């Protein structure tokens, strides 16, 4: 039994509630009609794959109920009262320690998605296909975990057939990679999807770093490409910024005072190449941020 | 946790296993790729509607797992070791008491599907759309329960929108009603589907009655229309038997010695009209068989 208590988010993706499962606080994502398929892929992933990781949004159950003589699709997960990284960054500013932890954990979590593992706690490789700051949740110990797997893709070296499902939804156009904005992404190849994930991590990286203080100054929060595209950008908008003009988020010049911000800037630059074969891997990213301080 | 133990049925619908849930005997229907949608509709029904009834196949859970780096859809229900009414009728012959009980319980179960109920143990009206002897299971107390809701349809007087889902599967052509074999069934109207259920009950009625002894004689088991159509009949086969030649299952003349078999024969005749508006309702059927002995 489950009781929704407190709606914490309304949107085009549906709604997220704080609920109780047996009095225990949990999060209930009610999917909208437009996303049935995203509920299925995500329920498919969490149930057929072990995903238990500190930096992946923890799963409890998936369920179907009826409000108003009509069916609602719920996903039921761990609840994080600080909320999304997007909300957190607006609310607050960061020091070096807190900055790196946030970005290390996103990479410690994405790497775990990205790689195949074997044995009793094994898993196929997974790509997210919708990495962004609104799809990351921030935990009381100030580590993040990755939410929203409704677009995800799987692969094993055991079988070597690609399972992309059949979801009519696409990414968030703001974080789309150039190959995707091109419609030149080779959908036949699994790594394509990883590399698409790496791009989006570079932009996330960029959103967080702005909120780290150095010489007593931060930039305000902005979404990527905030200066050059309107809210809810057309597909043909992002295409001209990213593919045609070939633009990227600016590095503020104050970052070049600081070695941490210069390091992270070196790093996000490596996530941002137009050729996807050239971008870094999550595991490189993880191990790199492991050294930086 | 669940462990399949013993496969009890392979077929085009997939497989049914005897399993354990926590050591408890249960039935695991593994759906084939061809039926995803039937798993969803059936998981939709059982979860969003209370269906707890002695003559409806009892639900425990629905689940997704991965054998061979690929996803299987399970439904997990009560297990009935005697198996399907189809298998039971071949195995055995019936007296009056056992005959009526079997057919009363099918009607006590279909009626419960067919009607809307209100309050704390309420339910919308449901049509089955695939009633047959293989979709009925026989219980140790020799009452039956209705299985397989993957084609089902729902309706409330509360809302009055029809929810037919979107399942590319059709009935079993052997039990298709003439309006369905016509492609003249008005898919906009809910009762159409009930009446289709009533037809199929008439044929089921006919299959069982053959196995009731009277004057020391039974007929062998046959599927409906066994004399005039081959195994796995074409759509255009059943059409010519039912719609064009306008045929029905014969009443054996020995039944007209017996009042019970004459009564049930009167009854199944009332399920078999070409016009669907003229067939009986499940509740009439139920209350009629309640009087007969
Ligand atoms: C990000 C997402 O899709 C999701 C899915 C299930 C649970 C949660 C979850 C758990 N705790 C919280 C606290 C806040 C929150 N905000 C939802 C809006 C940011 C997407 N989501 N959230 C998020
Ligand atoms: C009829 C059907 O689809 C179904 C679905 C879930 C469980 C069961 C069930 C429970 N106990 C038994 C025992 C035998 C059995 N036979 C499966 C073949 C007759 C369709 N099915 N079965 C049947």
Query: What DSSP line would sit under A11-58, residue for residue?
Result: ETTEEEEEEEETTEEEEEEEEPGGGHHHHHHHHHHHHHS----TTBPP
B43–A64 CB contact, under 8 Å: yes
Please state how this structure was obtained.
X-ray
Handedness of CA B267, B93, B142, B129 (dihedral sign): negative
Whether the CB-CB separation of A212 and A94 falls below 8 Å is answered with yes
The residues that bridge with A94 in the sheet, in sequence order, are: A212
Q: How far is CA B276 from CA A264, B86, B189, B190, B237, in A?
A: 73, 26, 12, 12, 21
Last residue of a domain, one of A81, A115, A143: A81
User: Within 6 Å (CB) of ligand 1, which residues are found?
Assistant: A 8-9, 16, 27, 29, 75, 77, 79-80, 83-84, 134-135, 137, 147-148
Asked whether residue B215 falls in the same domain as residue B193, the answer is yes
Domain boundary among B33, B61, B81: B81
| Final resolution, Å | 2.4
Helix (H, G, I), strand (E, B) or coil at A286: helix
Q: How far apart are the CA of B64 and the nearest CA of chain A, in angstroms?
A: 6
Which domain does A72 fall in, by range? 1-81
A64 membership: H or E segment, kind and range: strand A59-66
d(CA A48, CA A152): 13
| Nearest residue, CB atoms, B47 vs list A48, A63, A69 | A63
- A116: its two tokens: 């195949």
Residues A70, A97 within the same domain: no
CATH of the domain at B155: 1.10.510.10
Please answer whether residues B131 and B180 qualify as being in contact, where contact means their C-beta atoms are separated by less than 8 angstroms. no
- Kindly report the CA angle at B73 between A159 and B67, in degrees rounded to 5? 30
Cα separation, A272 vs A225, in Å, equals: 13
Same domain for B233 and B114: yes
Q: How many domains does chain A have?
A: 2
Q: Are residues A141 and A261 in the same domain?
A: yes
Domain termination residue (choose one: A56, A81, A106):
A81
Q: Are B97 and B54 in a shared domain?
A: no
Cβ atoms of residues A193 and A151 within 8 Å: no
The Cα–Cα gap between B123 and B6 comes to 34
What CA–CA distances, in Å, run from A115 to A108, A275, A281? 11, 21, 10
Residues A145 and A270 in one domain: yes
Contact present, B153 and B167 (Cβ < 8 Å): no
- Angle formed at CA B64 by CA B63 and CA B65, multiple of 5 degrees: 125
For ligand 1, mutation pick of A147, A171, A175 (most atoms within 8 Å of CB): A147
Task: To the nearest 10°, report the CA torsion of A45, A50, A51, A57.
Answer: 70
The answer on B150 and B11 residing in a single domain is no
Report d(CA B275, CA B192) in Å as an integer: 11
Eight-state DSSP code of residue A185: -
Residues B134 and B230 placed together within one structural domain of the fold: yes
A95 and A20 fall within a common domain? no
Q: In what order do the strands lie in the sheet with A71-77?
A: A2-11, A14-21, A24-31, A71-77, A59-66
Domain shared by A98 and A119, yes or no? yes
Three-state secondary structure call for residue A197:
helix
Phi and psi at residue A92, to the nearest 5°: -145, 165
Residue B139 and residue B205 share a domain: yes
We report the CATH number of the domain holding residue A15 as: 3.30.200.20
Beta B59-66 vs A125-127: how paired, if at all?
unpaired
Is there a single domain that holds both residue A106 and residue A222?
A: yes
B contact residues 25-84, partner A, Cβ 8 Å cutoff: 40, 43-44, 47-49, 63-66, 68-71
């Amino acid at each position: 039994q489950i009781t929704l208590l407190e709606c914490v988010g309304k949107g085009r993706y549906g709604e997220v509630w704080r609920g109780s499962w047996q009095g225990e606080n949990v999060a209930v994502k009610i999917f909208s009609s437009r996303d049935e398929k995203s509920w299925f892929r995500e329920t498919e992933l969490y149930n057929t794959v072990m995903l238990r990781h500190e930096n992946i949004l923890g799963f409890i159950a998936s369920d179907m109920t009826s409000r108003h003589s009509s069916t609602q699709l719920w996903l039921i997960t761990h609840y994080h009262e600080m909320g999304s990284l997007y909300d957190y960054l607006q609310l607050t500013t960061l020091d070096t320690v807190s900055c790196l932890r946030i970005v290390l954990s996103i990479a410690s979590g994405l790497a775990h998605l990205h790689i195949e593992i074997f044995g009793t706690q094994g898993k196929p490789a997974i790509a997210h296909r919708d990495l962004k700051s609104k799809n990351i949740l921030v935990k009381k110990n100030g580590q993040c975990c990755i939410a929203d797997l409704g677009l995800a893709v799987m692969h094993s070296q055991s079988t070597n057939q690609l399972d992309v499902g059949n979801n009519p939804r696409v990414g968030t156009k703001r974080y789309m990679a150039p190959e995707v904005l091109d419609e030149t992404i080779q959908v036949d190849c699994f790594d394509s999807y990883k590399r698409v994930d790496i791009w989006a991590f570079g932009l996330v990286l960029w959103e967080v770093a702005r909120r780290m203080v150095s010489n007593g100054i931060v930039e305000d929060y902005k979404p990527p490409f905030y200066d050059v595209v309107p809210n809810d950008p057309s597909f043909e908008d992002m295409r001209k910024v990213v593919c045609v003009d070939q633009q990227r988020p600016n590095i503020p010049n104050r970052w070049f005072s600081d070695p941490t911000l210069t390091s992270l800037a070196k790093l996000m630059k490596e996530c941002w190449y137009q050729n996807p074969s050239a971008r870094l891997t999550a595991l490189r990213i993880k191990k790199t941020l492991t050294k930086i301080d």
